[PDB]
Structures are given as structure tokens and as C-alpha cells.
Write a protein that binds this DNA or RNA. Sequence first.
RNA 1: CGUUUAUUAAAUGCGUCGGUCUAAGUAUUAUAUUUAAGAUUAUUCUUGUAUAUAGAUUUUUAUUUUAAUUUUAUUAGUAGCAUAGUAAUUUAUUAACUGAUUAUUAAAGCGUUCCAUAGAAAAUUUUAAAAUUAUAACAAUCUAAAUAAAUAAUAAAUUAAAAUAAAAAUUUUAAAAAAAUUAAAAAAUUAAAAUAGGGCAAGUCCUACUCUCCUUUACAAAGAGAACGUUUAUAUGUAAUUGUAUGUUUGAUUGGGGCAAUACUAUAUCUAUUUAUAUAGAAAAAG
RNA 2: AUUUUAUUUUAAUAGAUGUUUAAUGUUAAUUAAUUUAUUAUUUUAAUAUUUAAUAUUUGUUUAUACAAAAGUAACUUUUU
RNA 3: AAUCAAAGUUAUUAUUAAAUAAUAUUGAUUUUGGAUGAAUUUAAUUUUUAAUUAUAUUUUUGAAUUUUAAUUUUAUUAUUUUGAUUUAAUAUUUUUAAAAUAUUAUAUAUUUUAGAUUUAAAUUUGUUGUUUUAUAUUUAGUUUAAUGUUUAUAAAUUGAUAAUUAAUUUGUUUUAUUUUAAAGUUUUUAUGAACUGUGAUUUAUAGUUUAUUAUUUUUAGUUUAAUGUUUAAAUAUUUAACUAGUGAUGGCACAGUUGUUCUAUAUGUACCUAUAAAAAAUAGUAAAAUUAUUUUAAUUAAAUUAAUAAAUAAUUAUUAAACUAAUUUUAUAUUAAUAUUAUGAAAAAUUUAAAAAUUAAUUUUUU
Lengths: 189, 161, 159, 141, 165
Amino acid sequence: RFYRPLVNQGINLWRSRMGRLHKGWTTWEYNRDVIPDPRPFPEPAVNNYFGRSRIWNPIAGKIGLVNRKAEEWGWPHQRPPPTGLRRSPEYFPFFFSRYFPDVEVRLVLDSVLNNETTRPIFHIPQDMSKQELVNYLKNIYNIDNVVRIRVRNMRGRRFKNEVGEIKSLPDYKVAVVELDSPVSIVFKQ
Amino acid sequence: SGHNVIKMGWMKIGGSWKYSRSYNDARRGFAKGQWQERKMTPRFMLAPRVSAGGPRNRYEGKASFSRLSLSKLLWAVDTGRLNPNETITLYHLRNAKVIADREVVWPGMVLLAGNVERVPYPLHIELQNASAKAIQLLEEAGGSFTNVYMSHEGLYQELHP
Amino acid sequence: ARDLESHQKIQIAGRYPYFSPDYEIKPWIWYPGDTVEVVSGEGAGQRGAIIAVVKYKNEILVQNVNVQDVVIPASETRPEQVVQREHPISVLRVRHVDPSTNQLCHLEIVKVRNKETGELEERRISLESGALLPIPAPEETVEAGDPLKDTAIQDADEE
Amino acid sequence: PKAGCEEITRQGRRVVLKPQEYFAQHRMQVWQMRFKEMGPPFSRVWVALGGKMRRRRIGRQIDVKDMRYYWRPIEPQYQRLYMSRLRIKDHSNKRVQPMRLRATNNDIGQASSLKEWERSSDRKYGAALAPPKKRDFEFRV
Amino acid sequence: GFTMKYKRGTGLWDEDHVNDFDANKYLSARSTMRWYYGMERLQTRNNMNARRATQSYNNNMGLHHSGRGAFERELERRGIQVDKYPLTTTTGAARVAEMVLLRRQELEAHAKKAMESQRQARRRDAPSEWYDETEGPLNPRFLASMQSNYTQVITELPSSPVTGR
RNA sequence: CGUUUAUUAAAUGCGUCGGUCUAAGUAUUAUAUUUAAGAUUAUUCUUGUAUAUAGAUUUUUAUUUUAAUUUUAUUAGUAGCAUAGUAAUUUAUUAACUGAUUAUUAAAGCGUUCCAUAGAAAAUUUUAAAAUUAUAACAAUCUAAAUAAAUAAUAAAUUAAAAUAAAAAUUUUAAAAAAAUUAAAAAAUUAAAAUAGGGCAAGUCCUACUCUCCUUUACAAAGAGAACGUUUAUAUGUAAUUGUAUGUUUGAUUGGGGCAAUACUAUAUCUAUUUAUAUAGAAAAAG
RNA sequence: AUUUUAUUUUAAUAGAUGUUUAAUGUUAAUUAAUUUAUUAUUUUAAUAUUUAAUAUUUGUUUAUACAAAAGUAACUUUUU
RNA sequence: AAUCAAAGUUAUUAUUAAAUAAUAUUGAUUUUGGAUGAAUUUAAUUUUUAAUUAUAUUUUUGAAUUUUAAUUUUAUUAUUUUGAUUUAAUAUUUUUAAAAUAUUAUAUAUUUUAGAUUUAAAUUUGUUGUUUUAUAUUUAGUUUAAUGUUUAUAAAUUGAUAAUUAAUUUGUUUUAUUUUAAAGUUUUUAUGAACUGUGAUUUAUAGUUUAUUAUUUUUAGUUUAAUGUUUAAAUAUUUAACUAGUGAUGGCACAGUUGUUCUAUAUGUACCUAUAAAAAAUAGUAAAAUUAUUUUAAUUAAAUUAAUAAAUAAUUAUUAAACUAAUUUUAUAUUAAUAUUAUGAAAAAUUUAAAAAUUAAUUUUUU
């Protein structure tokens, strides 16, 4: 056995005067060994905020790499492609990009409606720089007259759904292109 | 259903605690690791240490034997738990529930002629250290007593052969 | 963000209880039109035909039973009307009456080797009459199709 | 949700079975040497020795230098004090007798006479109070 | 620590020497099926647990999954029996208890026919003198169960104590 | 002439001076201190720390540290100067517990003293707007009501008053005997207060040194052909952070007796081998 | 003076000479009136009062600089 | 003048909690590196996320304690597929929110007025309701086993050897518990130099007296005073004072037996007793409490001792006892066994003492 030691009373009470700094705590009582959690308790890693100052978490998570592999190549089952191919523009996600782009250059109509405009406004994904928006309209929509593009970045729209969770849409990038000869749209009522 | 407060009967629950000044103090319990006698030179400290181990101490190897009164053994032999023919070694005494486990320690036992003024039949025993009268009682009735004094290693192999 | 007030926390469970998975019952048994009647709740003994079924929540429009006065909203174009419609009613309180026997039957699935075809399609059968009730086949919409933005099959399956 | 609604969701230390003491603790040795308890059942004197028997002898009275030699009882006012630490073994059980000062020969085995110890060949029938064990002549550490 | 492990299987049934404080007064229909299935599980859950350990630890020590080293493999190749006491194997017990049941069953039919020898040697078409009730009223339920062993009716008891006829 | 948590003869700061340092910094230098600049001077004498020291302690005083109890010479002295005091004299004021002057044995100032001294704090004289006594003397701004609605505190009140006695207490009660509502002002009482002020008890804290004690890093010995780090032994340092520093009557007493109505607070007196139990050591028979 | 007033008895009760809970209360084998009798004079924690017909509150009139921390309750389409 | 005693029901919405169960486990809440790596490193013979069937020994004399239990054998770190089982718990919000008796000059609710009054608890160390707590409503609010039925058996003794004519019970082995709330502390490591210290840090946006670059000093944020006193402020309004910084609000730097200190035991994030964290320290030795009416045997005591009260008598208490001359044919609480945190007795009768009460005294001491 480990015999109960009588820490609180008796000599073990007075022994603190008899040259004993550290009066041990009873580490045989709580001996159910499952960790407590500190009173300055940590809040979970989920970004609770949904304001316009919502910040991108820079810290790399382990899972996010694993979830990347399982779709890049069947991860637990199919062995990896040799690192030479992965550094190459023939790697499928670099090949599915160089030939099958995935972009959403949506046009706002509230500025290109019946009122003639020389500055039609777009929305382009946050990671379409200016000279790509040129290349895009040039080679996909035949638009050949773009002298200046003017680019913002907007926090995606936010709202509370009828349930109550703040369902913030993705963010985008207003890019007010400036065509030479003005463009317009007709709406017959 | 009540608080047996000292110096005041047995009080009811919800009763008056005007007089439980020392029940709230005899519920904590006796001081632990502390001299019971607060003043007056504890009666233990006043008396002198005797026999550096104690007055009845048992060291490693002491001959302290549990007393098997001869009346018990004679009572059994007629009752029929013990067979008078077979030399009644301590196995028979243990296995016939004459003596239990809680009475056979290392010095095996000791036969004591307790009030037994007579033993009627020739009785044979292999026990440990009979008393001198108990020996001269069996020996008068044509019996024997060959005191086996086995080591502890022998005490086991006799009880669980 | 934070979570809601308790009975409004579970009001979110109370209002949309079909969002938990498997709220849809074990393999479907009730289809449109089948013989049905309500035994519990309201109007015991009201034999009806199942007009329409919404599955994800286990709900059915039992005709001529629980017809709830509909507050139809209309524009300035057409004048609104108040016509009643049979309200989506639960299925846990509706059973089947044998189309032949016309008594409350327990309809459950079976696998039957089909004739001239080997689908072994899961076929509903009563537990008393063995009425082999097949699963009704849905309909491909007649007037579906966009005229100007469809690549023709013969033009889209060119290997 | 009920006991504290937030003190019981976040978790602190959980307590477990509390170890017991040496359940012959209160036959401490300042009696296992000073006194010895004699007597038939229901009368146990804790006879002790004389008070002044080692310190100052020259010149004390001639017939009182020997009142120090008898096994006198200790007055019952102390019998009940010291034997109080022994009664506590199972209180409220009005029919268990107090622990005895010395270990009587039958109770020592009473520990190993329990249905759970019947399989410990060692430490049974008295092995501590046995003579020191004998080992192989080659025994060595 | 030490918890009487030499008693786990050494009980006469499956529910014995397993400390289960979690009981109840009335264990219901499926709480009893849950119970009986439970005792055997943690009796076979324990065993195959303890078998996978011994068979795997033995296999990792390079020797046969039941501890049989190179010797006890070489002896069996020679036919020299390597185990002193060959405790009866599963084939044994499942057979040593196969006939005993084959014996009782052939003794029941041997005795089912036997009692009819004596039952039909019971001429009493009317109840014996146990049919008295001067001590206390007969039991109507039982008579209906003893009507078969007679011809005259038995159950019909008057409002008065039975006279005897 | 800067600088500070209860804001200053607080602590800084320059110079001088004492000590230390020529293998990390320039010995008219930089460390380490004591003082305080400027101007006069800086007295007498040593029992301990330090230094030096010779196996160590024990001894031992060039300079330094601390000391001088009748050091007390210079010097100022009733002064932030232990009481004595309002010091005694002089002024000053109608009135001098002010303040300044003379001298001068100041309970034990004293050479780092004393002088010199500027805006400071006093004392006069004197002038002067704050509404300083006399003395009271609303021009100004700070409603009610309507609206919003918090705080201390809250055992109760139908009695609270009032007078008188009390009994432990300040009176508050008890008792006797007496007799007036809502609103706003006042603070006499209720607890108008907070919180300070005591002193006692047990508990803990924190600081200090000749006498208590470790973890202690220094001093010395030894061991390594001593190539340097470690280990010992002997030592125990307030550099050391442990614990004690009482109890009873008020400052002394602690014992066992006795006389004082076979009462005894310590009452009042005295006596004396009236004895000091245990545990380790010491005596090994009974001592 | 005497008489006459505050405690010298009875009757009903109801065990007795004052401090350790009464429980088949749906037969913890329940099934339409269980009428649940059991409730801590303070402690915290939540409410509600007193102070409170209130203390605060009260919107009538006008003397220009530009950074960075800091926020992000944040709308968007606007011509960087 | 004035009273007057009194409203128990919302209505409407559905799959958490807690213990338990002995199967998984490289660090839960985006997508490393994205130059090509050097930057995504936690490892060492100690009660450890490893948790151990005895009462005898032995022991600073006094908080120190028992050795495989069957050698891989099962006491072992655990869930989906019965809203996963079981037993205990039970709600939380939305909006509900109510009611018809007592005088007529004044003590307190009963109808018929008069009679009537500690509010309680503690504290009373009978300095005897001694100046303490309570606004109210409801919820939550404190752990010593009141029991021994057949297998079955115990019981002492020396200092020690031993001895045991020495006389005798009980027990299928009974153990576990020990109040509640409350410190300052105390030790064990994590956070902090945005406030504030000190280190370091800025090389010339107003006025002025003097011959002078030194020096008087404009001086609207700071040695005073008023107001404010839960205040507009957990330091603000008005104001006195002061103000000359080439040597300093400030790059980053020092951290808790310790930093910093022009030193005040001052400050190092709004009480320096640092914060934060982890304990069950002690608190019975005049702190606050300790929950269940109608009952069924009484009382006080006052001595030995105390580096001054947990211990002893005596009392009280729980449980149990047996009828020794004295009397009537009266009348008698005597004890054993255990439980026991106590030093001071109204009115008298007297006795010490300046007592100016304390002290002795000894009969009281209410259901």
C-alpha cells in the first residue's frame, strides 16, 4: 500500500518551521490523471469575428496540407508524383490552370445599364491583378480597348441569416475598367 | 436522527447549539500525531522504558505458540472430528475445522492440560511444545507426544502437502 | 458570433428538425397517389390519395385531409385567392390500405427477380396479402429544355 | 448546466479513492515498551513501572526506593485516554472490542486468514514473525 | 494491482466473480438481453483480447504462436509427445458432453415409457382420501389439473366442506 | 539651484580627503566610500573591526574604520539640543509662553565646527483691493410643476415625544407618569456617517545584531610530479531568507511546608538535603 | 381590630417524571380526482420593494486645420 | 385628526446534462516550405499522465511502515449501427404580472370592546436582551453505519529464555467515517518594461531684464487653496507656486530573494501584499453557521497542574447495574463502563484588600 500520510496535521504540520520550505501538496488524492485546463482558458482557434477587420490566419495548419494532398493525388493510396513533375507546369493543378482557368469576372450592371458609361465596373477574384484583367477581357470577351483599370478590394458582404449565423459571403475585388468608346445596355419595358 | 452532543443528552436536529460548544469540537476528531495529554507530563512519559523492545515484544523468531487447550482436542476426539487411530498431526486439526487459519502461526501450537484431570484412551499427537502436564497426561494413558518443532518451511508443507 | 438563447437555440432545432442527417426515414415507402389514410391525430378514417410528397422531411400532401386554407399572395397583375389546399401532413401517422383488400396494411420493401429483366428492383409488398406493389417510375418533363443554350446530343456526344 | 453551468463544463481535477492508514497505527511504541496490558476479559490494567527508578537514588528514602519496582496499574483516568485511540477502529459497532495493545497471536493470522490471502503461500501462517528465511548457499545480491 | 485474476474463469457460470456494481432492481426485457449478452462479451472480449496478446507476443519472440520453440517442434516431428499432461482438447469436451446428452435423451424416452407402466397402474377413477378438506378448503385450480387422472368429475365442490363422496 | 510617494538642513552634485588599482584603459587616472562647496579653522585619547602577523586562534592599534561616558581646547550655546522652563537678564508690546541681544557650567552641541547668507519660514515697523473683528449688508447663475428613475441604509413599528427612578453602561430599555397630522427647510437623537484611534488574544509577516542553526559559492589543510575545474576534512559569516525572544500577578515571582476561622487571590508571614519523572550516554547482578 | 384581595385546587383532558421524524402519500407490483404538508427566520444568487411625490438628466442659436497609434458597432457603385 | 383587513396564474414553444462502458489516438477549426532548404528539432538510469491485496517486525521513543500471485492471465484507460446503453438530474427562454370588511380628539389586527406585548437568533464566561447579524421573496445551503441466526474454531504470560494444575467469553472476521464558511500567509512555475523606474534615446515652432553666449524671467496643463467627496474623475474643475532641461515623457535593454532606485522600504500596468496559475495550510482554542414541534426521570463542579490551557479530578452525559443492622409498615440517584476543548458561585451571613471591586466564601440559578 501507499499509506495515508497525515499531511495536514501533526508533525507534518509543524515541520514547515523545522526547516522545510516546500510543503508538498497531496498529489495522491487527485490521482485521477486527466489534465485540468488553465483558468486563463484558451478560446478555440476559430476566428469568431465577422467584421470588416476580419484577419487571415497566417499560421499553417497541419490538416490543410493533408486535405491538399488527398485531392492533388490520392494520398493514402496513390504514391506521389516525382518531385520533378510537381515543380513543373505539367503538374495537373498547374495544367488544369494553364488551360482551364477558374475565374468569376462578374459584371455589375448598375453602372452599365441604360445610362451610357465609359467606366464599366467589374468584380474579379481577389487574386486577379490588373494586367490579368486586361488579358482576360482581351482573350475571352474580345474587349480590346482598356487604357486604365482601377482596382479596390472589398470585404465580402455580410449578414445574419434568418436562423442567426453571420453568413459572410466571399470577398471580391472591384476593378473599374475604363474602356475607350462607352458601352451601354438597353432594357425595354 | 440526533446529535449526541456530549454533556447534553442527545439533541434533536435543528435543536439549540447553545450547548454544543464541544460537540462542534469532538466532531473534528482527536488531534492526530499530537500528544493526547496537553499538560501534566503524559502518564506514558512518566513511566520508564523497560526491555528496550517492550514488555511482551515479538522479535523475528520468538517462540509464541497459540494455546490448543487439551479439552478442545479431547472434546474433538470423541465428537468424531478427529480419528483416534491416526497420529493427530496439525493437518488433521486444521482440516477438521478444530482450529482455523487464524490460530496456526509459525511456532505451531501448544498443548495445555486445561482442567483435564484424565485422558481415557491411548492418544497419539505430533504437536509443538506440549505443556509438561499435558505430556504426562498422554503418557499415562499409553499415548505418545513427539513434539515436532518444524521451521516455517516445515509449517507450510505440513498444512498443504 | 455567439450561440442563441436556449429555447431559441433549440427553436433552431425546433423549426428545422429535418436538418439533422437521417431524418429522412429508412428506404422510402410512400409515393404519390398510393392508397393512404390518417389513423392518428386528426380525422381518423379519412381515405385519400397522396397528391405530392416532399421527402427530405418525411412529409406528404394527403388529399381531402388536412386541407389548410391557403393565403395565396398575388401581385397587381392577378387577384389573389383564398382556395384551400391539402397541407403537407406527416407520414408517421399514415398507413396503407390494400388497393384490393381495403384494410390497413403494413407496406414494406422486398427484392423480387423481375420478369424479362433482372433488376431485382426493391418492390414494396404488404405483410399480409403479399400485394406486390412496384415502385412507380417518375416522369421526364415534357416541356423541359432551353432553346438557345443547349448543345444537341448528336452534336454533344460526337466522340 | 445545474451544479454551476460553467464550472462543471470546463474541467478541473477529479478526486479518487483516498488511501487508508496503517490500521494498527494507534498502538504506538511509547506504550509497546512502557506499559503492558494485563488482565482477564473486561478488566485490562495497563500496568506500568515505577516513576523514579533511574535518576536520583543516593539519599532518597530507604523504603521508597523500591515502590519504583512494582508493576503498578496506571490510574484509569489514563487507561481510558490511551485506550481511546484503540477503540476508534470500528466505532458505532457496539459489539466489536477495542484493539489490543500487543498483537495477540490469533489476530496476526486473522489478516492472512481471509479468503483473498489463501493463495499467498509466503506471508501466510506467520512469515514475518517466523525465523529469518534460509536461502540457497549461493544466494547473493 | 492484485485482483484475484485466478478467479475470472474459475466460476461455475459466466456472471460470477465479475464485479459489476452497475446493477438494477428490475432489469427489463432488453436490459436483460443486454445483460446476458454483456457478461459473455466481457468474458469473450477478455479472452480473445488475452489471446491476441499471447499469440502476438509469442510470434514476436520468433517461436510458434503458442510458445512452441524449436524443440517442441522437433519432437512432434519425431512423434515423441512433448507435453506431459495433454489436457483434453476442444474435440474432447465437446464430445465428452455430447454423449452425456445422447445418454439422457435415450433415458428420457426410456423413462417416458416407463412411467406409463405405473400411471396406468393407477385404477383410481375417483379421488383418494387426500380429497378430504376437513382441514381446509381444496384448491379449485389444482383439481382442474388433477381432473385428467380420473373419470368422475373433481372440480365440482359444494358450498359446504367436502363430505368425501 | 538639481531632485524626490506623505517634499524637506530628504537624497544628488564640484572641490578637498581616505582607501584600492600599473597584465584591460590614462595612479595629477579610474574604480569605492565619508563628507559637503565659499571663508576660518579643523583640538585631547584609546580596550574593539581592519591592516600587518610568525601552523590559527589568543596576542598586536603608522595611515583608514568606529570610538572619547571627564574627550571638550576652538568655536557657537535654551539651539529642530532628553527634563529643568515661558531659562535669568535686556529691550519690543498698553499687556512679550513671542523674537532678538548680552553672557555661558549646554541633564551628555562641539571641530566638520563656525562664519559669512538669497527668492523660505519667523519677528518687528509700515502700507494695503480681496466682504479680515466691528458687520449685518441677494446684482449675477443654481424653481416648482410635466418627463425619464438610480444610491448608501432598511428586523419592526402607530406610537414616538417629554419628565422621574433604575441597573449591569454612555443611555436605552422596563416601569410610572404624562399628551399630536401631510410639504420644505435645519442636524439634537436614532449608525448624520464613513473610518481613524486604542490596547489585549491567538496567527502570520518583515527588519536587526557577541551569544540559536543547513543547503553558502569565501579563508585555510590534504589529495593529485599540484595543468588551473573536483572531492574531503576542519571550520561555521546575520553576507544566512530557520526558529525562538513567556507565563503569571503589572517590572517581581515559579519550590515544598507552616502559621494565620484544617477558607487563600498571592493575602500576610516565614523556612529548608524536603528531594527535579523519561529518553541517549555514565554504573552490568540486589547497588 | 376584624373582615377583603396573586398563586395550598378541581374537572375535563390526556399515556408517564420535558431534545435521536412521523412514510406500502398510486400497493418504486399505481393508473381520472394522491387534493401531499412541508416549508433553514442568516449565508450567495436571482428577483422585488423601501430611500423614491428624487439624486442625477433637461439641447433657444454660429470665431476651421491637415500625421500616427487607436476602432472596424461599417453602409456601399462610382469614377484615385 | 384619521383607518381598511384583502387576490395562488403565465401559454407555448422540443431529443441536452452527470457518472458509467476497458476496441481509436502523433499535437481540432484552411491549403509548410512557395528563396529552394538550413529558418517547421525536445531527446538524458530519480513515487513518472506507469496510481502498490495485510494489524508483525524494525524505527530520529511519537505520522515510517507488509514482501510474485499464478511467470503476456483476463485490473483493463473506454462507441457506433436500442433518439447507443444505463441510473441520477430538468429544464430555458418568449409574454405573462388583477380584485369586493373595523375610526369620528391618536397606544399596537379580530367584528363585543377591554385585557393584552422582549421581533428574533446568537452573546448571556449571570460586566445576567451587554449594542452582533437580518429589507423582503424564492432557489441552492453542512455525512460518526442505533441490527451481530444453523457449517466454525478465538480468550492468556516473562524483562527474556521459558513456563502455562492457573482456571473465562464473543466474532463465517465486523475496520473505511469523521463537521460547514472564512484569512493574512506559505511554497511551486508561468505572464508583464505600452503605466513607471533607470540604461538609452531630439543637436535651434512665441516674450524678456543685464555689459555677458552665463543671467532676470512670457509661461494656459504639474509643490498651494477652494469646489468636488459613489464627484463630470477609483483624481477632475478653478487657482497659488514654479518654470530656461548640450543632457532627456521617448530607439531596445534589464523581471520577481528580484529589476530599478538623485534612498521615500518608493515604484516594476489602474492598493507591490506584483499579476496569473495550484493547493482543501492553519481559524476551537471567546469569528459566522450546523436543516426534521406536540417530549416523559433529577443535579453542576471549583481540587493536582499549566515557558496558561485540546489533557485530570469533580461535575454532566450515553449505556448498564446490585436490594447488608440501625427504626417509622418512614425515607432514601448509590454505582460500573465509556463519552467530555471549563478554573471562578445572585441576595444574604462574614473575610481579606487605599479597593474605588476583585477576592475568598455557600444554598440559590424558571418550559
